[PDB]
Amino acid sequence: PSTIEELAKTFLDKFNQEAEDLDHQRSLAAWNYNTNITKENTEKMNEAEAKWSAFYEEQSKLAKDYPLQEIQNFTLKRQLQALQQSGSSALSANKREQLNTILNTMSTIYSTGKVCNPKKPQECLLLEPGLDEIMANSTDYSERLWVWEGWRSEVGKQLRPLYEEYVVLKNEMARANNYEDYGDYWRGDYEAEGADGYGYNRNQLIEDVERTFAEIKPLYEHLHAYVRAKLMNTYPSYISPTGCLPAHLLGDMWGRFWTNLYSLTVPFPEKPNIDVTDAMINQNWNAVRIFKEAEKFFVSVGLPNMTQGFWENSMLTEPTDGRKVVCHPTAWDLQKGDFRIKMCTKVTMDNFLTAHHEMGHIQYDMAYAMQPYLLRNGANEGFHEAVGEIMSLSASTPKHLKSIGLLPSDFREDNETEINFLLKQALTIVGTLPFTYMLEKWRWMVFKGEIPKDQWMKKWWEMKREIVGVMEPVPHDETYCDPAALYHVSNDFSFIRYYTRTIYQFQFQEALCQAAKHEGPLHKCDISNSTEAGQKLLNMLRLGKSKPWTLALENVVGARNMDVRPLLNYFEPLFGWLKDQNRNSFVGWNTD
Amino acid sequence: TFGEVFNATTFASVYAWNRKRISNCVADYSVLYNSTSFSTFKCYGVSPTKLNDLCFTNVYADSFVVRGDEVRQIAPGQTGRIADYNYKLPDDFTGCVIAWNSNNLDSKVGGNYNYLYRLFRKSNLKPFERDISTEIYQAGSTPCNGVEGFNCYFPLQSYGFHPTNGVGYQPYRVVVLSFEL
Numbered sequence: 001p002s003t004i005e006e007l008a009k010t011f012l013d014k015f016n017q018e019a020e021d022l023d024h025q026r027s028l029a030a031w032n033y034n035t036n037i038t039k040e041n042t043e044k045m046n047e048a049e050a051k052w053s054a055f056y057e058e059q060s061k062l063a064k065d066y067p068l069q070e071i072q073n074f075t076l077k078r079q080l081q082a083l084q085q086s087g088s089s090a091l092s093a094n095k096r097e098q099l100n101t102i103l104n105t106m107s108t109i110y111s112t113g114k115v116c117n118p119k120k121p122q123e124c125l126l127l128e129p130g131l132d133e134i135m136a137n138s139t140d141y142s143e144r145l146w147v148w149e150g151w152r153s154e155v156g157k158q159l160r161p162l163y164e165e166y167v168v169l170k171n172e173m174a175r176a177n178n179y180e181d182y183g184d185y186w187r188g189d190y191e192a193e194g195a196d197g198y199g200y201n202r203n204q205l206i207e208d209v210e211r212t213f214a215e216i217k218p219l220y221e222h223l224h225a226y227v228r229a230k231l232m233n234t235y236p237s238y239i240s241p242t243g244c245l246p247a248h249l250l251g252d253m254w255g256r257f258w259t260n261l262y263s264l265t266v267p268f269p270e271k272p273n274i275d276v277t278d279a280m281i282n283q284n285w286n287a288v289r290i291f292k293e294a295e296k297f298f299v300s301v302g303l304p305n306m307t308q309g310f311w312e313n314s315m316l317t318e319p320t321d322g323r324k325v326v327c328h329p330t331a332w333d334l335q336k337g338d339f340r341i342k343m344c345t346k347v348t349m350d351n352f353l354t355a356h357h358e359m360g361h362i363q364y365d366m367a368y369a370m371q372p373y374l375l376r377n378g379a380n381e382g383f384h385e386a387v388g389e390i391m392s393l394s395a396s397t398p399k400h401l402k403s404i405g406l407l408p409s410d411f412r413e414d415n416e417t418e419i420n421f422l423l424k425q426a427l428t429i430v431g432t433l434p435f436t437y438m439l440e441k442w443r444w445m446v447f448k449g450e451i452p453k454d455q456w457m458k459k460w461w462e463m464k465r466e467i468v469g470v471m472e473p474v475p476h477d478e479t480y481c482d483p484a485a486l487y488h489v490s491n492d493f494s495f496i497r498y499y500t501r502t503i504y505q506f507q508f509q510e511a512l513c514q515a516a517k518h519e520g521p522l523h524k525c526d527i528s529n530s531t532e533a534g535q536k537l538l539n540m541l542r543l544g545k546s547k548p549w550t551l552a553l554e555n556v557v558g559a560r561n562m563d564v565r566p567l568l569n570y571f572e573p574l575f576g577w578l579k580d581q582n583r584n585s586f587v588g589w590n591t592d
Numbered sequence: 593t594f595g596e597v598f599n600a601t602t603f604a605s606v607y608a609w610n611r612k613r614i615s616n617c618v619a620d621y622s623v624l625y626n627s628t629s630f631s632t633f634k635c636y637g638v639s640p641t642k643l644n645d646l647c648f649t650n651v652y653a654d655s656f657v658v659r660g661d662e663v664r665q666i667a668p669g670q671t672g673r674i675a676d677y678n679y680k681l682p683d684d685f686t687g688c689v690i691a692w693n694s695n696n697l698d699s700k701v702g703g704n705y706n707y708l709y710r711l712f713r714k715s716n717l718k719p720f721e722r723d724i725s726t727e728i729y730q731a732g733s734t735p736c737n738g739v740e741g742f743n744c745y746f747p748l749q750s751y752g753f754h755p756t757n758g759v760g761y762q763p764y765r766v767v768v769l770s771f772e773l
């Protein structure tokens with residue numbers, strides 16, 4: 001006579017063990033493919049994935065067989081709920097197949113969708129390493145424009161039909177799963193069941209996003225006017241001082257990041273931005289040294305140093321020996337206590353900075369290994385790169401790298417450079433906050449039925465001008481599908497992470513700096529050498545997904561919910577400068 | 593005289609823990625207690641130095657291999673999965689526990705799943721009890737007809753040992769010496 005909760009717990013224990021084992025085995029299988037791309041290794045990685053995938057579905061059904069309402073241990077309940085989310089198999093089997101075909105085709109199109117300009121048609125560059133390398137450093141409006149509508153026309157026509165069906169299937173699934181619509185499904189991820197004043201509801205998320213964006217908007221506007229102005233001197237005939245910005249000119253295929261506008265919008269080109277790569281190069285540093293310096297950083301605050309297995313097994317540089325591998329930074333938890341990083345790093349300041357967040361990931365991974373497999377993750381999708389970006393912030397401090405011999409003692413960063421850097425930070429960091437919020441607002445509304453198919457494009461761009469203060473060269477009707485041209489949209493990826501993650505980092509860095517009694521501007525804080533912050537950073541690092549991320553956060557930063565104050569505060573210096581620079585000009589968009 | 597047990601090529605998996613008894617005191621603990629390799633050597637109810645002076649009624653050598661992490665379990669008053677369902681040692685235990693890293697021997701590239709361990713059991717081992725039954729663990733009220741299904745699980749699973757593993761999840765051998773007074 002063993003209660004349903006009891007019996008269920010027993011289920012989990014068996015799961016965790018079966019799951020751990022299989023996950024490790026996939027993991028290794030995938031690690032050999034990555035570090036060693038070989039036809040055989042490809043085959044083996046797919047096979048092993050297939051067993052993991054199959055296994056997961058089987059176990060998910062069974063999980064459902066325990067009635068969620070019956071469980072009383074919330075800590076238990078949370079692993080359970082997480083497991084028993086049905087996949088795309090909680091509906092017709094004949095529908096399911098259709099859906100996967102849609103998806104594979106989309107990515108497929110998107111994957112290899114090449115565009116060709118009228119002139120030199122035979123050029124017909126590819127999205128991957130073609131257009132993108134243009135949009136980034138091209139100041140010809142005509143060039144940039146053709147590279148913009150082409151992609152949006154070509155794949156758009158193809159993607160529009162697919163997308164509509166895509167929507168219908170996903171709503172059928174969400175509804176199947178007692179969800180209002182796909183939108184509300186994705187808003188599940190931020191749900192908290194702690195129910196002791198720490199609970200969280202998928203409805204609260206929309207309100208909270210909107211509210212915070214409301215508080216961000218002032219900042220955004222002034223960044224926007226400044227950047228518009230500098231652009232005018234570059235693309236003088238097309239921009240209008242009381243209006244929005246034409247999209248193609250934002251450095252990327254979409255204006256996700258104004259990073260590439262720095263050359264154009266640098267406030268003081270006289271003072272070069274401080275690049276410590278020549279320092280490293282001339283000091284005959286190597287990849288290993290970089291990662292070792294990182295390690296020290298974590299140690300100095302209180303974190304463990306990396307496993308022996310980490311140095312032994314990890315790939316930290318491109319294989320000299322003719323092993324072709326895709327090279328992107330990655331931080332792996334291979335689930336048996338084997339932790340590793342796979343960035344084929346090269347010697348630059350940036351890589352140095354990167355390794356501090358990739359290692360940051362790893363330290364997270366290590367921190368919650370005592371938690372059970374299901375609970376073995378950061379409390380929501382934001383935290384993991386929210387914590388692996390925060391180390392890249394302390395690590396980049398001029399204080400910090402002076403400290404480790406980054407430059408000459410008493411470097412004395414001047415305010416001209418300091419502001420110059422802050423702005424660069426803002427192009428990428430504040431640049432994308434509106435972009436992102438507007439996109440997930442469109443998708444959320446679509447999924448709730450708030451937008452008809454014929455009003456799709458009309459409502460999308462109406463939102464772009466209103467919120468992002470961006471406008472499109474040519475009008476687009478409902479033949480054009482533009483939002484699908486973004487990877488994450490057309491590859492069925494949730495997208496609001498980018499926003500929440502960005503508000504997370506600074507609440508963190510601000511609580512850690514406030515704990516390391518740092519004084520003065522928040523952007524020069526460096527937490528190194530402070531165990532006080534370390535221990536308190538850990539205290540949340542250990543929980544993993546085990547407590548409602550609201551409690552997770554409140555431990556670190558004393559607040560149960562997102563607050564944008566630390567963002568504003570981090571950027572406050574650039575703010576005041578921007579108001580000055582915009583003292584004599586117009587701030588705002590006019591929609592047309 | 594017991595050199596053969598320690599350096600044996602292969603070890604019993606923990607649920608079938610091996611028991612070997614010795615009749616001759618020709619062998620000494622000089623070589624053992626003075627050994628760099630032994631990662632653990634907790635002697636309970638005795639003095640590791642004092643061992644060479646005495647001889648005892650019954651000597652008992654149980655050998656088996658576990659997860660690094662789990663070595664802490666083999667000791668009096670220890671409650672865990674291994675101590676509950678695999679090799680409980682009685683509190684009033686007088687003897688000595690020995691363990692050493694066994695990575696190079698027991699884990700192979702691509703894994704060595706051959707060592708196993710008992711996951712469920714309807715109740716805890718009695719000190720030094722050995723249970724090797726393979727009957728399906730009927731957690732539920734519904735009885736399982738000798739096949740694992742909803743609410744009944746096979747109770748034996750296999751340690752996965754790879755050279756890459758973490759130390760805690762790395763495989764070390766263990767030998768426990770029991771003394772009769």
Ligand SMILES: *[C@@H]1O[C@H](CO)[C@@H](O[C@@H]2O[C@H](CO)[C@@H](O[C@@H]3O[C@H](CO)[C@@H](O)[C@H](O)[C@@H]3O)[C@H](O)[C@H]2NC(C)=O)[C@H](O)[C@H]1NC(C)=O
Binds near residue numbers: 404529
């Ligand atoms: C964190 O605290 C440690 C503890 O001191 C700091 O390490 C030390 O940093 C100082 C400043 O760069 C270095 O000082 C030099 O020491 C030598 C003697 O070893 C002396 O001849 C020089 O005149 C100079 O004072 C020292 O090398 C270094 N020592 C060690 C063991 O690392 C570290 O800089 C602190 N970091 C931060 C960010 O606060």
Ligand SMILES: *[C@@H]1O[C@H](CO)[C@@H](O[C@@H]2O[C@H](CO)[C@@H](O)[C@H](O)[C@H]2NC(C)=O)[C@H](O)[C@H]1NC(C)=O
Binds near residue numbers: 035036038039040041
């Ligand atoms: C990269 O992958 C290849 C193939 O997946 C590995 O080649 C195998 O090498 C072992 C060891 O000699 C042979 O037994 C297999 O027959 C090989 N497989 C094939 C089909 O070539 C290669 O060793 C890997 N290289 C490393 C170490 O990264």
Ligand SMILES: *[C@@H]1O[C@H](CO)[C@@H](O[C@@H]2O[C@H](CO)[C@@H](O)[C@H](O)[C@H]2NC(C)=O)[C@H](O)[C@H]1NC(C)=O
Binds near residue numbers: 305307308
């Ligand atoms: C990380 O740093 C600490 C430094 O104290 C290491 O802890 C000890 O390091 C010495 C090495 O001189 C060892 O002899 C000790 O055994 C270590 N402590 C323990 C509890 O074993 C720690 O080992 C370092 N990292 C690694 C991977 O060993």
Ligand SMILES: *[C@@H]1O[C@H](CO)[C@@H](O)[C@H](O)[C@H]1NC(C)=O
Binds near residue numbers: 598599
């Ligand atoms: C095991 O073999 C090695 C080499 O022969 C030896 O050093 C060791 O002492 C042997 N066993 C024991 C129990 O010491």
